[model samples]
Structures are given as C-alpha cells and as structure tokens.
Target: NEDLFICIDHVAYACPDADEASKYYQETFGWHELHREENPEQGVVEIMMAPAAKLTEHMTQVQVMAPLNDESTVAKWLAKHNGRAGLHHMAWRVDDIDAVSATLRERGVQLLYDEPKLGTGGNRINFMHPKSGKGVLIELTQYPK
Candidate 1:
C-alpha cells in the first residue's frame, strides 16, 4: 500500500458560507480561486483555490465546501459541531482509482462506497472512512485522462 497513493490533491474546509470562505482565502491568504462547482449528489458547493494564479503539474489545492441543503452530509457535520466551521477532509490524487481501490480493500481499509463516484471537477472520487484514516477523513480522487 506504500505506493497506492500519488499525492495530496486538496484539503477541504467545511463552512456555513463557502462564498465568504473563498473570499477570505483570497483576501486574507492571497490564494487564487481555480474552480468552483456544485455537486448535487454530494450536496456541496465547492470552490477550489491555489496559492498562486498558475498551477503546476501536481500542485495541491484548497477546497472550500458548504452544504447545499439541510440533508447534506456537510450540514450534518456542521450541526454535529455546533455550527462551527473546521477542516473537513483531505484528498489524495491517483492516476488509477480502480487499482487504488483494490489495494485499499486488500489492506482492509474501509471505503465509503462500493464504486468511485463523480466528484468536483469531474474527477472520480471515493472516501476512506475515519476508521481507516485513524480518525481523519480521507478522500481519493483521480482526474480524467
């Protein structure tokens, strides 16, 4: 499993207001907005940001996520935390999601889904349960070829 992963794709911050969060990242941290999308299935509106305007081959990004509805997982997360925002999840990039999924299952890591699901920016994505990450939520993503 040592080579099952590629690199950190993004780190997500869950908040009540992603628009404001994106603004904060730009005005406060000088991060540049790279992309933004709303995933109805995931019920999150996400904004991708980077440290600069130009992106490198595998540069990591920051993701700001806000719940789209009351039933959203992020909404539940916020409710559980008493309406306070916090770091949500970390995403790992891989060239082949099927291969990585197989390896993770072999290693007994619990994945949230039976198959990879569509994610932000049209990437195939899946999540590692907190137990697998030892209390940290982990998201796995693979960009289209």
Candidate 2:
C-alpha cells in the first residue's frame, strides 16, 4: 500500500506556565496529561496532555494535548494570544528540508527560522511565519517520511 501524508496530526497550543495552563485546560475543557517531557535544548518542559480521558477495558485515552513553556516564543505567544490558546504552528511531513526551504524562499515565503533547526524525533525542522502562511507558522519536517 502506498502511504500518503496528511496536513497535520496535531497543533501545539501553548501557555505561559504549566500550572496556569493546567487550570485553563482542566476547567474550560478538562484537558489532562497523557505524556510529558522536558526539552532542555529549548529550555522548557513540554506536556502532551489532553482534555478528558476515555475509559477503556484497561486504560484511558486523553484528549486535547497541550504543552506548557515559559520561554521567549511561548511566553510571547501566550501574551499575544490572550490566554486563549490557538494554533501556534502547523507541522508538515516532508521528504527533504533543503528542497522545501529553497522552494519556499523562492516563492517569497516568510521563513521564520530561515534555516532548519533541531526538533523532536531527531529530525531537522524549519519554520515559516504566520504572516506569510496565513496566520499559521508552518513547520517543515524531514524525517523518516
């Protein structure tokens, strides 16, 4: 079977701090934690949590995953987005970062990062600003895709 890559599996919605964000997700939509990790490279603790959990025969499934960070970009985003979390970036699976980056640049896309940077999953990643991508920062990821 031929595999096809879709638009996005998830959009990272961030907040200023973990505790404050925990409250919002818990009260508003009842988002809870399913998994969490601390990203030292980015100097932040990321929590892949969700809103509510579905009880099954053995375990539960968490919905509405969230990540909390107190860094520059996330803090700024939290303030700018006004406590209400929205799509911070749109992730895409790519075959080649250089190819996409060159094409995007040639097409006059606002390359937010200009070059690929380190990301989760040990893959090279690049970011395009929302202004150029219609208010959604696009992350081009070249992994095992």
Candidate 3:
C-alpha cells in the first residue's frame, strides 16, 4: 500500500566499533562514507555509508553503529547477542511516519515506542517490535519537510 512505505531508507548494523566496521565495508564493498556523528540521545556513534558518486536522494545507506555507553541500547544488544555484530534494524522511508504509524496501530500493530524519536539524519523515526516483524526490528523514518 502507498501508506506503508516509500522505499528502504537504510539498514543498520550493531557492532563493537563503528569506525572499524565502516572501514571493513569501505574496503570490501567500495562504499564511501557519507556521514559520521555521535548521538548522545541514542548513546551511539554512527557511520553512514553509500556508493561513491551517485546522488543519495533515493538510495539506501548502510549504517554501522556502536554504543557510547554501557547502558546504551546498542551495548545491551551486543551483550545479549554474545558480542557478535549483526543487523540491528531496517529503516523504511515514509512521507509521513506518524500517518503510517497511526494506520498500523489501527490495524493492531505493536510499536516499540509510544512516540517517534529523532534519528541520526534529523528524521523522525519509530520502531516496530521484532515480535510483529518476524524477528527483524523494523524502523519507519520520515525526513523533515
């Protein structure tokens, strides 16, 4: 449905070191780093990547992130997953995340949080619990208008 998603925004991977993980992908896949930032709210350092030259307007990125604190969600995930790095979540771009969320809620979907939160690229983001997404964490992202 048109209300469901616009496109795959990006896929995030949780790792012990975002810098190292970014490098591994840069060398292996010939991907270029797009942005890097430390998000205090999420307590994680992020490294965003995409292909070398094409415009990223409608492209999907690869994000590698590591926890900034032991109490952070990423740290907790790493601990629970036995320190192995893997897919953390997949984000889908939407024109209006709230509208999609409301639609999903009306259909009896379970969301991870009560409200959307700010994500790395100044986007409003909300998560769908893995329980409802077949064991894969799903995120809906809406860029600022």
lDDT of each: 0.91, 0.60, 0.87
Q: What is the descending TM-score order? A: 1, 3, 2
Q: Which residues of candidate 2, in runs, are more than 4 Å off?
A: 1-6, 16-35, 47-70
Q: What is the TM-score of each candidate against the true structure?
A: 0.93, 0.62, 0.91
Model 1 lDDT tens row, 1-145: 1677778999999999888988999999999999988878778899999999998987999998899999998999999999989999899999899999999898898899999988886799999999898889999999999
Question: Over the full model, what C-alpha lDDT does candidate 3 score relative to the true structure?
Answer: 0.87
lDDT of 2: 0.60
For model 3, state the Cα shift of residue 79 in Å.
0.7
Question: What does candidate 2's lDDT look like per residue over 1-145, in tens digits?
Answer: 3232334434566654655555666688777765555666566555545544643332322212233445555666667777775556656766677777787788787676867887755668777877886876767766655
Per-residue CA lDDT of model 3 for 1-145, tens digit only, reads 5557878988999999999987887899888888999988779999988876464567998888899999899999999999988998898999988889999899888998889988887889888888877888999899899
Badly placed stretches (over 4 Å) of model 1 are: none
Better model by TM-score: candidate 1 vs candidate 2: 1
Candidate 2 TM-score versus the reference:
0.62
Clashing pairs in 3: none
